[PDB]
Symmetry: D2
Subunit: 125 residues, 4 copies
C-alpha cells in the first residue's frame, strides 16, 4: 500500500467548515468530493489529485495536491481551485495547504483572474 | 462533449520546454502525463485534474487545474505541483497558469515548503 | 491621522516567533524592523511599506504590505520577502498576511526563485 | 553605492502598460511612484520597497520588492499590492516579479481577499 494511503483516506474539514472526502489509491491517486462552506458553490463537486505514495521516512510530511472545477449539477462558478500541500500524520493529523483559485475571464480581466489562500484540514470539526 | 474538450486535448509545451500531454473528458476530467524540462524530474509523471466543461460564452477563458506528484519509476522528489489557470482557444491557443510546488518537509522547514510560479503552455514549442 | 495609525504602530509577533516592529505614518507609510525566527537571518532588518490610511467603515479590514530585503550588517541571504495582508482591529487585533520570498537566482534556477507562505501577526506572544 | 543602484533607478513598464518610477538608494531603499494601466486606479501612487544592495557576483539576479497601497488623492481601492522579484541587468534588463494584491474585507469574505499574479518590467514600452 502507499505509506499514507490509510492516513489520507477519509473525511477532512477545513477552517471554513468545508468538507473534503478523499480516497487515496496505492499508486498515488486521489479521488473524492469537495463541499465548500463559502463562495459560489452548493453541494458536492468532483475532485481528483495525486500524492507521494512513498514519502521520506525522516519525519517529513507527504506532498499532495488536488483540483476542483466549480461545476456540478447545481451551479457553475466558471473557476477551478487547486490545493497544494502536505499531509502530516499522527494524533492531530493535518493537511496543510495553499491554494490557487482561477476564474475564466476576458483578456482584459485576466490580470485579476486568480485568488490565493491557505486551508488547513483536520479529521475533526 | 465539453465545450473545449477538443481544444484542450493534446500535447502542450511551456516556456521551460516541459511537455504536458492531456485528455479532457466530456464531464470535466483531465488525465495525462507531464514531463518537466527542469528540476528533480526525469521522464513522464501521471497527472490528473479538472476543467469547466461548460464555460461562459462571453469570450471568457475556461478554468482548469491539474496536479503532478513527482514520483515515478525513476525518481521521487517528495513534492507535488498544482497548476491553476485558464485555457484560451483560437489560432494561438494558450493555457495560462500559476502553480504551487509543495515539498514534504519537517515541521521546522514547513514555512519554506512551497514555491510559486507561472507557466504558459502553447500547442507549438 | 491614519484611521488605524495607532492600531498598527507597535510590536507584532507571528506564529514562527518572528518580531515585526512598525511605525505607521498619517499618510500611509510603514517603517520599522523585522527579526525572523527562521531561515538565513540574524538580528534586525529594515522594512518599509504602505497601508490604507482611510479604510472602509463597514467592518472591513485595512489593507497593507511591506518588504524586507534580507541584507543587514550580519548576513546577506540575497532575497527579499513581501507581506501583503490586512489589519483587523479589536481586542484580538491581528495582521493576516500572505508573503512572497524571492531569491536572486541564475536564469536556469529562476523558475524556482520564489516561495509563498502565510503569516499571522498578533500583539502578544 | 548599491551594486545595481544605477541599473534599477529609473522608469519601468510592465506587460499591462503600467509605469513604475523608482529610485534605488545606496543602502537598499526603493522609493517612487506607480501608475497602473488596469484596475481601480488613477494617476500615481506612492511606493516604497527594498532591494539587495550587494547581490551575489555569480550572475544571479538581484532580489527586491515593493508595496503600493491603492489610495491617492483621486481614489481609494482599499487594497495594497506587493511585488516580489529579481532584477536582471544587461541590454535587455528586466525586473521579473510575482505579486499579491490584498483587499480589506469583512471577516466573512477574507478567504477571498488576495489575488496573485506576475508582472515583468522592462526599460522600454
Ligand atoms: O466561488 C467560487 C467557487 C467556490 C470557491 C471556494 C473556495 S476554494 C478555496 C477556499 N477553500 C474552501 O473551502 N472554499 C474556498 N468561484 C468564484 C470565485 C470568484 C472570486 C471573486 N472574489 C471574491 C469575492 C467573494 C465575495 C464577495 C466579493 N468577492 C475575488 C476577490 C478577490 C480579492 C478581492 C475581491 N474579490
Ligand atoms: O524539482 C522538483 C520536481 C520538478 C518540479 C518542476 C517544476 S513544476 C513547476 C515548473 N513548471 C515546469 O514545467 N517545471 C517546473 N521538486 C522539488 C523542488 C524543490 C525546490 C528547491 N529549491 C529550488 C532550487 C533549484 C536549484 C538549486 C537549488 N534550489 C526551492 C527554492 C525556492 C527559492 C529559492 C531557492 N530554492
Ligand atoms: O532564509 C532567507 C531569509 C529569511 C526568510 C524568513 C522568512 S520571511 C517569510 C517567513 N516569515 C518569517 O517570519 N520568517 C520567514 N532567505 C533565503 C530563502 C531560501 C529558500 C531555500 N529553501 C528553503 C529551505 C529551508 C531549509 C532547508 C532547505 N531549504 C526553499 C524551498 C522551497 C520548497 C522546498 C524546499 N526548499
Ligand atoms: O484594483 C485595485 C487597484 C489597482 C490594482 C492594479 C494591479 S497591481 C498588480 C497588477 N499589476 C499592475 O500593473 N496592475 C495590477 N484594487 C482592487 C482589486 C479588487 C479585485 C476585483 N477582482 C477583479 C475584477 C476586475 C474587473 C472586474 C471583475 N473583477 C478580483 C477577481 C478575481 C478573480 C476572479 C474574479 N474577480
Ligand atoms: Fe472581482
Ligand atoms: Fe531549499
Ligand atoms: Fe532550493
Ligand atoms: Fe470579487
Ligand atoms: Fe466578485
Amino acid at each position: 500500500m502507499g505509506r499514507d494511503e490509510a492516513g489520507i483516506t477519509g473525511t477532512w474539514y477545513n477552517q471554513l467548515g468545508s468538507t473534503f472526502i478523499v480516497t487515496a489509491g496505492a499508486d498515488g491517486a486521489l479521488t473524492g468530493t469537495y463541499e465548500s462552506a463559502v463562495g459560489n458553490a452548493e453541494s458536492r463537486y468532483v475532485l481528483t489529485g495525486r500524492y507521494d505514495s512513498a514519502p521520506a521516512t525522516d519525519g517529513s510530511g507527504t506532498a499532495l495536491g488536488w483540483t476542483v472545477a466549480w461545476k456540478n449539477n447545481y451551479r457553475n462558478a466558471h473557476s477551478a481551485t487547486t490545493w497544494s500541500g502536505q499531509y502530516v500524520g499522527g494524533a492531530q493529523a493535518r493537511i496543510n495547504t495553499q491554494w490557487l483559485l482561477t476564474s475564466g475571464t476576458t483578456e482584459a480581466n485576466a490580470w485579476a483572474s486568480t485568488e490565493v489562500g491557505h486551508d488547513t484540514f483536520t479529521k475533526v470539526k
